[PDB]
Each structure stands twice: as structure tokens, then as C-alpha cells.
Structure 1
Amino acid sequence: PVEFPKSLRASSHSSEGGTTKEEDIYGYELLYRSAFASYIAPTGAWNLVWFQAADGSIKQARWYGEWVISTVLAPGKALQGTPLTALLWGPQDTVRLYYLSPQFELQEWCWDTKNGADNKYDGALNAAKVKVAPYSKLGAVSFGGANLRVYYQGTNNKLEEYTFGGGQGWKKGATLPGDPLPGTYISFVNRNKWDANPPSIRGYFQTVTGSLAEQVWETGGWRIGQFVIPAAPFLTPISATVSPEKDFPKIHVYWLSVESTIIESVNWHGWKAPKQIDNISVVKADISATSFTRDDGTVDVRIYGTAQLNVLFERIFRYGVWEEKIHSISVGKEIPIEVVGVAAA
């Protein structure tokens, strides 16, 4: 078997007090610790997830009754271990996916489905040859329809913005405040509706001290926000998502604990205390959150990431509760392996 810390739960079928003896799955055609991007349709009718296959291609898992896997970027297009982040607007007919080339330049993939067409092509961001810090992660938002913002870590470790819209093409945007940890995970969200202008932008990242911090664009340009988590694990995955609950934006910020469990902090008329959403230890690796508002005004959340041993998980917050059924999305060949919980020496 493989050994796992006895005090941690490897899956939803682990013993209540930790891992004893169980079977878990290794999907070996998913890149180990793959990046994830995602977007659920605002109607909730279908789901998009993007990930990196072991061969380095970028693939898509789309749920519509069942999951369907396809390839969106051929092997050779993306850095092995590229970050990923996605946009969806129109309200839901135009997709952009951002990634890094093997030369650490910002790249853009476009998927347009307006009017029943289907066009897939490289975006113009590639032309700017934006060289980023090699460990940079990526975030992005859209507003006013096709006004786009891409956030990355520049070569001096500051967070940086690139802008698109208004017929201007891609142009360098702001340099953001703060002192980001080299290699920090980052996640940016727009609190206002996809077709609204101005946007209300928030970004989440880890600083050089290990704390978590917030970028705010509201009025008067970029400022550091009130969200402060004094300590978090080194290079903790971070993903945030926002949708209106009872007619006010509900920001959800997710990161990992030292036990590799998912911690959530909500901003909804103020920040609420961080709390663990479940006690199952995921692989310490990129996560991706998305959300939508139901007709009744409540907000559903989906989180994707890597579960033990190497599977793509889907965690579901629906009608106010995290469901205990945590699904896995198969992306290729798999082997089952026995897992035994082992105590410290």
C-alpha cells in the first residue's frame, strides 16, 4: 500500500478519525498537481474545467448531463506546470483561457460561440510577448462585456495588470501595490455583473511575510484592502469567487490549512471568520472556485482541485451546505491503490 498520515483523512470514505485502510485512485494522465481553471454557467446548466494532462496538453472537462473531456491546447503550447485562469461572458458564449508558454510569456486561447458559430484560436495577447516571473500564477476578470484584465507576477515579483478593451487592444496596465511572495497563488474576481461598467475588482495573494492580502480596485485606482490573514502555509493555493447573494456580492476566498484542508473566508457585509469547509486533506496543489446565483438569490459554489492520490475533485456548496458526496472527474487511465494510515515514528 501507500502510506498516508494517520491523523489526516484522504477521502470522504476515510474513517472519521483519520485514514486507517482504504482504496484511493491515481489518475496518471492528469499532470501531478495540475493547475485548474473553471467556470460554471450563470444558469448552472453546465460546467467548464480546464487542466493540464500529463503530456502537457491543456484539456477541458465539460459537464452537460455527463462530463466530456476534450483537448483545447496541443502538447508543446504550454509550460509544463503552467498556471491557468479563465473568463466566461456574453453572458455565457465567450471564453478566454490564459496560460504560460514554455518561454514564460502570457498566452491567450479564445473560444467564441455567439450565433451558433464555434471559433477556437490563439488570442492577440501572445503578440505582446509579456515575460513573467517563471513561477508566476495568473488571474483575470472581465467587465462591460469584452473589457479584459489579466493579472500576473512580473519579473521583480510585483503583481502586474494587462488590459484589453475599448478598441485599444492589449496594453500594459497598472503595477499593483503590496509585496507579493515570489510564486504566490493569485485569484481576481469582479463583484459587479459581467456587462456592467465600472467593475469592482478584488484580488487575493500571499505576501512575503506569509500573510494573505487583498488588492482592491473600486475608486481611485488600486489599494490594499482590509482582508488580512496573518499566517497561511507557504505557497498555499488560493482561489476566490463572487456572486450576488440576496442582492449583494458574496466573495468567497479559499486557501489550504497546514492539514491541506480547504479554508473559506466570506465577505458579505463584512469579512466572516475563516472556517474549514470539510476535514478531508486534498493534495497541496492548485484549486479553482466558481459560483452562480440561483433564482432564489442564494449562491452555489463549486471547487475543483487535486484529491488523493491524483484525481480531479468537485466539491459542491448547494442550498447552503457543503455536500458530503465529493465527486471525482476521470480524465484518463487510472489505477486503484491501497492506502494505510501510519503514525509518526
Structure 2
Amino acid sequence: PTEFLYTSKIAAISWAARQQRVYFQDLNGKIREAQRGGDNPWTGGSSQNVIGEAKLFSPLAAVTWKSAQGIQIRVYCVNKDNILSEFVYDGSKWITGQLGSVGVKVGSNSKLAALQWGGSESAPPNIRVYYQKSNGSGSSIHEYVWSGKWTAGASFGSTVPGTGIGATAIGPGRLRIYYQATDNKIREHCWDSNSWYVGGFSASASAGVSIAAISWGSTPQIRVYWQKGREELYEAAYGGSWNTPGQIKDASRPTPSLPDTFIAANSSGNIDISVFFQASGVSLQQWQWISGKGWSIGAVVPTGTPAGW
């Protein structure tokens, strides 16, 4: 056995250096980090890798950028009073961030997504966090905004209860948000300049899929992932138009995730992609995309070993 909480949410980040970090919850409610550099074995995931804490079964999201102080990471979660909360890696240490002090109440079954653009050693970051206030069918998605200070943003959509949410900045100040609407279709909401509008993407999916989204490049390339636990992973790809969604699967390892589990995706470069899932073990696994090979299940991420094992 491991210390990975069954039906923990997952969050993941990646940057060119390739450095990856993945966040998950342990049996004690702590948020742990595992790390990978290049194709070296994963490190971390132990009781010595706690970065924060949240209510048990808290949703999670994470973003990263490089700053003059080093690598910045923000991990979003919910506390035991269902208040939207944030842990900060400030380039050298983990601390509690300012978002928790705002008093944003989140629906108990809400998921979280986050995106960032612009942050660098010569420009400030722009963060957007997406959440729901209500658990019921037809609830909207709400946005909280950091472009110097936290303030409320938009609300949009009418969703399945506790919908998955994918969020990606496809270009500077250009946002795409993916969620599952009340007809069980994945839908898309878009910001290009001065307004939100309904996007052209849609796809039928199992009720209650976990959703993730990434993007890169100039077209830009967008990939939207969804998975119901113990069903195969799906990907929709945009390269100027949307393709027909396809399964990412391994005939020798059918539907490798456990029921009622979540996914997370990261990307960096042009292009490295990880899509994390939770399997028997309880284990943290991932799909990996490699140029010239395709998709495969990669190395297992360590998530601790309880005493007596």
C-alpha cells in the first residue's frame, strides 16, 4: 500500500530546464509533492515532501512560472471551511499565499482549475482560478483573478454537478476553459481580448469525467483530456480545427485507473506531455507522449509507504 489518498485530486506542472512537479493528497490530508528531472527516476512523494494541507478530498490545481526570485509555484486547494486557499513556493520556500484571506467560499464538491500567463524575470504573472460555488446541476463556473491583487472575475456556464474544469492560456491573455455542461457535452468558453464567448469545441463524454487541458505554440495547439475512472483516457486535439476525440490506451493494460478517480496534465517544451491518473496500489501513474513513439504508460510516481510495510 501507499499513502496516496484514494480519490485524491491531482495537480501537475512542468517547465523546460524538463522539470515536473505533481501534487496529491495523503491519508492525513497533507498535500505532497513529487519531482522529476528529465527522464531520471521520480523523487519525493513522502511525508518529508509536504507543501501544504487541505480538507480531505480537497480539489487541487497548480501553476508555475520563472521569476527573479526563482521558480514560482502556486497550489490551489480548499480548507476545512470550504475557503479557497493557496500555497506558494516563492523560489526558495513553501508558505501560505494571500488568496485564503480573501474569503472565497467554494461548493463542497467543486473542482478547481488554474492558468497563468506572462510571468517571467521581466514581467509580472497573471493567474486565473476557476471554481464553483454550488454543487447542484446547472451551477456556473466562477473565476478569481490575480493581475497584481486578487479580485473576482467572470461567471459562466451551466454544468453537471461538480464538473471537471480544464483551463489553459493558449496565448498572452487568451484563455480557454473546458467543462461538462448539463447535456454531458464538454463545452468551451473563450477569452481573446475584452469579452467571454462560447467556443466552437464540443464533445460527448461520460457523466462526471475528470477534465484537463494544455496548450502551446503559435497556431496554437490545444489538447483537452477527459477520463472517467476505470474508463479509457480521451484526447481532443486542436491544430487549427478540432479532430474527432480519440482514446489513449494500451491493449495490454485496459482502463488502468480505479473507479471515481481524477486526472491532471502538464506540458512544456514543444512538446512534452504527462497525463497523471490513479490506479491500484494505490499508485500515481501517468501517460506520456514522446515525439516519434506516441503514448505509453510511464514510470510510477512514488507516494509513500505506511509504517509496517
1:142 and 1:324, CA in 2 relative to 1: closer, same or farther beyond 3 A?
closer
Instruction: Please point out which of 105, 124, 130 is paired with 1:151.
Output: 130
Structure 2 matches for 1:182-261, cutoff 5 A?
A: 182-192=161-171, 196=172, 199-229=173-203, 231-244=204-217, 247-256=218-227, 260-261=231-232
Shift of 1:133: 1.1
Structure 2 matches for 1:102-117, cutoff 5 A?
A: 102-113=80-91
Residue in 2 aligned with 1:292? 268
Q: Deviations over 1:93-139 (max 9, x none)?
A: 111000001111100110011xxxx1321111111111011111111
Shift of 1:300: 1.9
Residue in 1 aligned with 2:234? 263
Instruction: Please point out which of 263, 286, 300 is paired with 1:314.
Output: 286
Task: Work out whether 1:283 is the aligned partner of 2:262.
Answer: no
Residue in 1 aligned with 2:122? none
Q: State the identity as a percent.
A: 27
Instruction: Please point out which of 78, 95, 103 is paired with 2:54.
Output: 78
The separation in 2 between residues aligned to 1:225 and 1:84, in whole angstroms, is 25
Does the 8 A contact of 1:233 with 1:258 survive in 2? no
Does the 8 A contact of 1:315 with 1:327 survive in 2? no
Shift of 1:144: 2.5
Q: Which runs of 5+ in 1 are unaligned?
A: 1-26, 335-345
Runs of 4 or more above 4 Å deviation: none
Shift of 1:185: 0.9
Q: Which runs of 5+ in 2 are unaligned?
A: 120-124
Residue in 2 aligned with 1:330? 302
Does the 8 A contact of 2:3 with 2:305 survive in 1? yes
Bigger CA radius of gyration: 1
Does the 8 A contact of 2:248 with 2:295 survive in 1? no
Task: Work out whether 1:99 is the aligned partner of 2:77.
Answer: yes
Does the 8 A contact of 2:285 with 2:297 survive in 1? no
Residue in 2 aligned with 1:3? none
Aligned with 1:60: secondary structure? Answer: strand
The separation in 2 between residues aligned to 1:248 and 1:219, in whole angstroms, is 17
Amino acid corresponding to residue 93 of structure 1 in structure 2: I
The separation in 2 between residues aligned to 1:278 and 1:171, in whole angstroms, is 41
The separation in 1 between residues aligned to 2:131 and 2:195, in whole angstroms, is 17
Instruction: Please point out which of 142, 154, 161 is paired with 1:174.
Output: 154
Aligned length in residues = 286
Shift of 1:309: 4.5
> TM-score, structure 1 length as denominator?
0.78
RMSD between superposed Cα atoms in Å? 2.0
Aligned with 2:113: secondary structure? Answer: strand
Q: Deviations over 1:282-340 (max 9, x none)?
A: 2241101111224xxxx221111102342100211011433435321121228xxxxxx
The separation in 1 between residues aligned to 2:240 and 2:295, in whole angstroms, is 25
1:259 and 1:52, CA in 2 relative to 1: closer, same or farther beyond 3 A?
closer
Does the 8 A contact of 2:208 with 2:228 survive in 1? no
Q: Deviations over 1:267-295 (max 9, x none)?
A: 1111011001114312241101111224x
